[PDB]
Ligand binder design. Structure first.
Ligand SMILES: CC(=O)N[C@@H]1[C@@H](O)[C@H](O[C@@H]2O[C@H](CO)[C@@H](O[C@@H]3O[C@H](CO)[C@@H](O)[C@H](O)[C@H]3NC(C)=O)[C@H](O)[C@H]2NC(C)=O)[C@@H](CO)O[C@H]1O
Length: 405
């Protein structure tokens, strides 16, 4: 006691996330044993629904859950400004956690920390080394010209080159590829400038990225049924051997290595987005963007339970179990290399380590309305209802509106 009930909003709803959910449940059970009186009510919600609908609406009402999956950057800035996020600096000092994270920048607003990343990420191309060899491609492409040559060769063998599930409410999956394209063509400063008014979506180098995205679809390099598939169905297209590569975040590794379902688990490699030439060269999309935040509206009993949860979730033993089983990338420093380290994770590590630098996802840097508009727009682009030129015009219109607000 005191008796206290806390809702814990998480996104670990899909079958492929069952190990992540079980680890969360283990931490919750430990916390309940440590804090008599405290009961956690887990509320699992699909990724897009939580971020873009449910938590958004709860925050608008000033009634978020006590604990919730949260994104750094724009989302955290909005909710912190509105006064709905618990500042964590003193808690981190109390728990010995102040210096334990690789990077808290996305969750920091005016020096105060408003969430804790659960994992790191990079985005890049997972690829099927067998299908590449079938098409005569014997190395991972380093440059755009080598990449287009590989796509040509795969297409000529009637191998679907790029898996992608971007239908329904899953436009963000298209935006993974779009974001690396427009950073490759325009440089990382372009996406930093959209919300500051110093760059525009209509800048020719940004438009160039959307022209290339459209050309990948026009050529049949992106799966023609992209708009008919959910995100996870695009992943399955890849990890069942039905397409040669997949642009995705490193949180997808476990699905690609799954012994029950992935036929590519022993024939898979990785490469970072290839060099187009210019200020985007040798960069990799990545950072520490997603984890738990906490309501600022907690009584003393609730805050004790929340502190215990933080103590029990953010520990190297939990981070190490996540890495050892699901190849989940630590957000905390000092996790030893697993004794059986996985080749695919080694390849992702090599792509990240040899990059000049990382850049965050564009949705850390633009307002939610801008993000959702891009999702709709890229679906329309791939469906032929919007040209690249009309897309960037529509995007700058919404960006101008958001910047005025
Ligand atoms: C195979 C499997 O089920 N893996 C689970 C992971 O999906 C999950 O990681 C989270 O995945 C979501 C996507 O479903 C990631 O969200 C995306 O993150 C990028 C980068 O910040 C952002 O640009 C996208 O907008 C965002 N998409 C949406 C819809 O929000 C999220 O970052 C991942 N989070 C973490 C901590 O890695 C993990 C953990 O929940 O569990 C796996 O089992």
């Amino acid at each position: 006691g005191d008796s206290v009930s806390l809702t814990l909003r998480h996104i670990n709803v899909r079958d492929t996330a069952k190990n992540t959910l079980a680890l969360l449940e283990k931490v919750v059970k430990k916390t309940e044993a440590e804090v008599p009186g405290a009961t956690f009510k887990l509320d699992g919600v699909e990724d897009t629904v939580n971020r873009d609908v449910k938590l958004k609406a709860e925050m608008a009402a000033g009634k978020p859950p006590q604990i919730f999956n949260l994104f750094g950057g724009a989302d955290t800035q909005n909710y912190a400004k509105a006064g709905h996020l618990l500042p964590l600096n003193d808690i981190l000092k109390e728990l010995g956690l102040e210096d334990k994270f690789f990077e808290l920048r996305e969750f920091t607003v005016d020096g105060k920390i408003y969430g804790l990343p659960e994992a790191g990420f990079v985005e890049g191309f997972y690829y099927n080394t067998k299908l590449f060899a079938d098409a005569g491609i014997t190395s991972a492409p380093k440059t755009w010209d080598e990449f287009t040559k590989a796509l040509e060769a795969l297409k000529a063998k009637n191998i679907t080159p790029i898996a992608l599930g971007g239908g329904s409410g899953d436009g963000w999956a298209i935006n993974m590829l779009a974001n690396s394209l427009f950073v490759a063509t325009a440089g990382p400063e372009a996406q930093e400038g959209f919300a500051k008014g110093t760059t525009k979506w209509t800048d020719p180098a940004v438009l160039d990225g959307f022209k290339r995205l459209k050309d990948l679809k026009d050529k049949g390099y992106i799966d023609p049924n992209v708009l008919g598939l959910k995100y996870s169905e695009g992943q399955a297209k890849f990890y069942t051997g039905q397409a040669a590569m997949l642009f995705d975040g490193s949180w997808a590794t476990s699905a690609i290595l799954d012994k029950d379902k992935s036929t590519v688990k022993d024939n898979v490699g990785y490469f970072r987005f290839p060099n187009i030439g210019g200020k985007g060269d040798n960069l990799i999309n990545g950072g520490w963007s997603n984890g738990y935040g906490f309501s600022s509206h907690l009584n003393d009993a609730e805050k004790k339970a929340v502190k215990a949860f933080i103590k029990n979730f953010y520990t190297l033993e939990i981070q190490g179990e996540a890495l050892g089983r699901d190849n989940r990338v630590p957000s905390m420093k000092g996790v030893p290399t697993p004794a059986e380290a996985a080749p695919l994770t080694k390849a992702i590590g090599e792509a990240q380590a040899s990059a000049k630098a990382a850049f965050p996802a564009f949705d850390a840097l633009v307002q939610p309305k801008v993000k959702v508009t891009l999702e709709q727009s890229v679906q329309e682009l791939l469906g032929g209802q919007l040209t690249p030129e009309k897309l960037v015009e529509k995007m700058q219109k919404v960006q101008d509106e958001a910047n005025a607000g």
